[PDB]
Amino acid sequence: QGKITLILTALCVLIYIAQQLGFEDDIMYLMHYPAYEEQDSEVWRYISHTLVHLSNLHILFNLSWFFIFGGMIERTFGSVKLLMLYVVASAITGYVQNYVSGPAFFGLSGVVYAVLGYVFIRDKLNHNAAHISGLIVGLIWGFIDSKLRKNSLELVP
């Protein structure tokens, strides 16, 4: 199993648990995605919204599907690759969610979808704005990778 997978999966569990133990209101205010010109610069906001879950199922599904497949990416492409995907798909699925619906969204689906998006193409070849844009970031990113991969393998035994 992967180190970053597990730091991340660990993290969503603690924060959920704490959302229960007294207030989510602290958590939700600190992490939400900029709703506000000032908050623009509060840079953790682009990502942090991914770390808050809205229900026992919202989280059980996201963590199973991210542990398992985030699992895959880390163990196959390394921990940096998984960290980039997390960071980039987090910021982008959010940027895309804020535009269509505003800054009231939380959790790891956009991420999970990027994650599945990247595993699907890569598998396929070499074997809810957040959701779609995430999938797309996945599907695109993997294809770019696959391409650079095959590129160098061309001067190899």
Please, is 33 exposed, middle or buried when counting C-beta atoms within 10 Å of its C-beta (0-12, 13-18, 19+)?
buried
What residues make up the domain containing 112? 1-157
Resolution (Å units): 2.8
CA dihedral 20, 18, 49, 86 (to 10 degrees): -130
Indicate the residue type of 24: E
CA distances from 5 to 12, 51, 106, 125 (A): 11, 13, 19, 24
Nearest residue to 93 via CA among 125, 124, 136: 136
What does the block give as tokens for 62? 């996201």
Asked if 49 contacts 32 with a C-beta cutoff of 8 angstroms, the reply is: yes
Q: Which of 109, 133, 146, 152 is catalytic?
A: 109
Question: How far is 157 from 150, CA to CA, in rounded Å?
Answer: 13
- Tell me the CATH number at 113: 1.20.1540.10
53 is catalytic: no
Helix (H) or strand (E) holding 131: helix 129-153
Residue-wise over 78-101: b if at least 16 C-beta within 10 A, else e? eeebbbebbeebbbbbbebbbeee
Distance CA 150, CA 25 (A): 48
**Annotated catalytic residue 41:** no
Rounded CA separation 43/147 (Å):
32
Count up the domains in the chain and report the number: 1
Catalytic residue among 32, 49, 53, 131: 131
